[PDB]
Design a binder for these strands. Structure first.
Lengths: 35, 191, 164, 117, 138
RNA sequence: CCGCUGAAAGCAUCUAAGCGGGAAGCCCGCCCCAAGAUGAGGCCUCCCACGGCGUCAAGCCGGUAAGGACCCGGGAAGACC
RNA sequence: UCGAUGUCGGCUCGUCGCAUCCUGGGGCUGAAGAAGGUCCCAAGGGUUGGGCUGUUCGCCCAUUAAAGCGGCACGCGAGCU
RNA sequence: CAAGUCUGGGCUAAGUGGUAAAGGAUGUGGCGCCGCGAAGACAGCCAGGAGGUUGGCUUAGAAGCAGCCAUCCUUUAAAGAGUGCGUAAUAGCUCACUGGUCGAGUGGCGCCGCGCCGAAAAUGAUGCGGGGCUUAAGCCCAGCGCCGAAGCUGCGGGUCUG
């Protein structure tokens, strides 16, 4: 999403690592956090 | 010789059901010449004379059935090309010569207040100041008439032997009649 | 840390481990940059690192090997839902005939090892001698025949949900 | 085909760096080397970016030219020359350094393969 | 570190028009707080804002005492071009002296505030340091 | 961009290691040159060791129509070439 | 650089580049469809006639999928204008 | 392209090295804190997922799950001023609460040293180049010797000033 400033939402939105990449995964489309 | 070939008869068209133009091509079976194979070491072309009577005036399918008639004893009639299929064909250009930026290449020249003014034909420019000097781009007056030319989806309709001859869909055989044209059929889309 | 059940034949070499038993005749890969514990009745995590890193490495190998096991012993079955009022599917030929509109339906084949079952036109599943490949192609179809949640219908990994 | 045995060399697993470097020094002094192995020798982990740099070689193609060999053959070629001097001596040396696929005589497969093996 | 003309002569003796010093509340123990460590003519307005920002996010107890104040001034463009500089004034600020006692969030136990200053923090302008004073915070 | 398989976090995770899904894009494929790519490449066909002089005579003479070339005669081949 | 580098706009020839207008691939919606909007990936090719204005730009006409931003001395006068 | 692919002890796995700021984020590696595993501990799992709580503005609906004000009592396994998905307020799940199984190390904030996102570009690419990922090499701290100026000594000659 914003590419820069990813910071958790649903009370369980996950900080995961893919390609030295910080993307956040949750169970709501409403989270798709991607830097 | 991997392929099928001959020359330029002429174009005209007539008949069909609506009406289609075509061109006729010349070729009985211009004889056998070895047979493509990088076998055992390099094997590429041999010539156990079985030739013309002039020719010492100068002295796996396709090619494979070519093994067929090649072995036969030289020549091999042409027309594998049958009832409308698609070869393709190469023809040497037609020596047009050395020309103007114009037909060498479509380019608008001398607009009007000056299209004329004892002024006309001569491409317009070459290259920005600071980028520097000259591309290998913008063609130039780039001669035409000896190019080796040819095309795709060459639909051939029919043939007959009153001499080995073919009638192909849409001439464009490139060069003029009495000239060298070769045809394969390759990577057909209208397969 | 795990056991190696009946018929569990475990060959460790090269860095592969052939693992053979019942409806489970397998031969898998098991790394050469760490360490193997294989012993006649059971088996486990060597420690050619002992440090958090390769640590993960062999905790993983624990699970993996385990796989060679349960696998080679009693295979793998993934439970697939065909939920399509209209969308429907059944066995045909040595493959799966699924139908979900579009026009053409599809013949999907589970190559050597992969087996698909049409218990009953509506629900369909996949058993394969192994969890990896199984779950894998399985989902392959499971997405292949769209699960669009707009408002229900689609292939769906057993037990999912609705929407709005 | 066949030849001498002056410099009787092969690679694999090696550090594809000073390997060439010596490749060189001998070449240099003036010793024709024949070596084989391409594939099996090696080069810096991070396999990915490794491939990277090397296709850098791969498509570094500008009008004027800029080929960049796509087989191990080249990989080495480039490196080595990379250690020589274009003037005569360099040149000829290069003629004098010759290696091949695997064996035509008595990580170093991955990026050349990747970008043009 | 160039500065103003004469504090009665260029621009000297104001009220730096701003938004005062104490909001937040009392207490004897827990020092909860904000200080920094950058060096700069702290941005009047900027600051003022930032600060009242914090205020904004909160409203009461938790000493929002704020130990800063803009008292000198910047200048530029007003006259003929670029050569001879008469003097237009703007920018009242203060020398944030590379770290120091900035603004506090002082109180017994009200983390609500702590977070709040935090807010004020992210706010501010030059990175700033988030912190605790003489005992910790509770 | 989406998955499976699964550590390190005895509970999740597409995930560093293992495997796939996916672009009018990249590589290849189509067509157009092209070893003067000095790393001059392949193949076939054909011509056979002339001379007499100091030598590692790899230097000077008839040659073989193997062949080709010049001149002439002609080409949508074309400024000349 | 003043023993000198010819400053607009146009022309003709163009060539990058991406923040991509049109394209394709994406995830997202307050997305059903459909069409929209949010952003990520990608520069392949493609990106129209007038009109008035020295103009660039611009306003308007009729189209279109589109009718892209910007670089190259705001590219081009030993090429015109 | 002249000289240790020196050896010694750390940390890097991004080619960072071969330019960047704010700001991210159980990356990695080293240092201090609060709560316990036999009130046998965090994630797993079983379960009741207590009652006066449904209190005020706005209610038309706060009755945590519109928002502005509270934040008490409690009979008893505690408590949940019930942070949390919603809907018209209500009406279910979730731990802020723990038995057995486990069973032996778990969740925390500071201090750090090294590193990835943010950090798009125009004739073509770039550590200088060839190059390198536990002597690679880089980066830190250790000792080591060898390189290298016409600079300093040997060698010999020129020269001015005293």
């Amino acid at each position: 999403k914003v590419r820069s400033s990813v910071k958790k939402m649903c009370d369980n939105c996950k900080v995961v690592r893919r390609h030295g990449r910080v993307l956040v995964i949750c169970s709501n489309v409403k989270h798709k956090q991607r830097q | 010789v991997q392929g099928f070939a001959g020359y330029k008869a002429g174009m005209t068209p007539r008949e069909g059901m609506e009406t289609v133009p075509v061109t006729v091509i010349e070729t009985p079976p211009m004889r056998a010449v070895a047979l493509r194979a990088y076998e055992q070491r390099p094997l590429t072309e041999v010539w156990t004379d079985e030739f013309h009577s002039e020719l010492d005036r100068t002295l796996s399918d396709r090619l494979d059935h070519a093994l067929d008639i090649v072995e036969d004893g030289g020549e091999h009639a042409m027309n594998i090309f049958r009832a409308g299929e698609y070869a393709d064909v190469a023809g040497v250009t037609k020596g047009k010569g050395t020309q103007g930026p114009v037909k060498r290449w479509g380019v608008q020249k001398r607009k009007g207040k000056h299209a004329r003014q004892g002024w006309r034909r001569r491409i317009g420019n070459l290259g920005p100041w600071n980028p520097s000097r000259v591309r290998s781009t913008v063609p130039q007056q780039g001669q035409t008439g000896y190019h080796q030319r040819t095309e795709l989806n060459k639909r051939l309709i029919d043939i007959g032997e009153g001499g080995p001859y073919t009638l192909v869909k849409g001439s464009v055989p490139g060069p003029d009649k009495r000239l060298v044209p070769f045809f394969r059929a390759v990577r057909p889309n209208d397969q | 840390p795990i056991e190696i059940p009946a018929g569990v034949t475990v060959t460790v070499n090269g860095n592969t481990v052939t693992v053979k038993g019942p409806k489970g005749e397998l031969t898998r890969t098991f790394h050469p940059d760490m360490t193997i514990t294989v012993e006649g009745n059971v088996i486990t995590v060597t420690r050619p690192s002992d440090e958090k890193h390769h640590r993960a490495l062999h905790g993983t190998t624990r699970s993996l090997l385990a796989n060679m096991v349960e696998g080679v012993s009693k295979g793998y079955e993934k439970a697939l839902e065909l939920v399509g009022v209209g969308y429907r599917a059944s066995k045909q030929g040595k493959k799966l005939v699924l139908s979900v509109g579009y026009s053409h339906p599809v013949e999907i084949e589970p190559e050597e090892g992969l087996e698909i079952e049409v218990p009953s036109q509506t629900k369909i599943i996949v058993k394969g001698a192994d969890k990896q490949r199984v779950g894998e192609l399985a989902a392959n179809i499971r997405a292949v025949r769209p699960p669009e949640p707009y408002k229900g219908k689609g292939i769906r990994y057993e037990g999912e949900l609705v929407r709005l | 085909a066949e030849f001498d045995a002056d410099v009787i060399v092969d690679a694999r697993d090696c550090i594809m760096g000073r390997v060439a470097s010596q490749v060189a020094e001998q070449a240099l002094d003036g010793e024709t080397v024949a070596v084989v192995n391409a594939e099996r020798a090696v080069i810096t982990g991070r396999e990915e970016q490794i491939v990277e740099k090397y296709e850098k070689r791969v498509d570094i193609g500008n009008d004027n030219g800029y080929f960049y060999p796509k087989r191990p053959d080249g990989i080495f070629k480039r490196t080595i020359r990379g250690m020589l001097p274009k003037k005569q001596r360099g040149r000829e040396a290069f003629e004098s350094v010759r290696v091949y696929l695997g064996n035509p005589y008595d990580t170093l497969g991955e990026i050349s393969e990747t970008l043009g093996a | 570190s160039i500065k103003p003309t004469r504090r009665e002569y260029i621009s000297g003796i104001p009220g730096k028009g701003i938004a005062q010093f104490k909001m937040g509340n009392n207490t004897y123990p827990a020092q909860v707080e904000n200080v920094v460590e950058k060096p700069v003519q702290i941005r009047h307005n900027a600051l003022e804002a930032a600060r009242n920002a914090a205020n904004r996010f909160v409203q009461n107890s938790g000493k929002f005492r704020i130990r800063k104040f803009p008292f000198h001034v910047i200048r530029e463009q007003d006259g003929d071009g670029m050569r001879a500089p008469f003097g237009k004034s703007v920018g009242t600020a203060a020398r944030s002296h590379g770290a120091n006692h900035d603004f506090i969030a002082w109180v017994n136990p009200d983390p609500a505030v702590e977070f709040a200053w935090r807010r004020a923090y992210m706010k501010v302008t030059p990175t700033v340091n988030i912190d605790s004073s003489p005992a910790g915070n509770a």
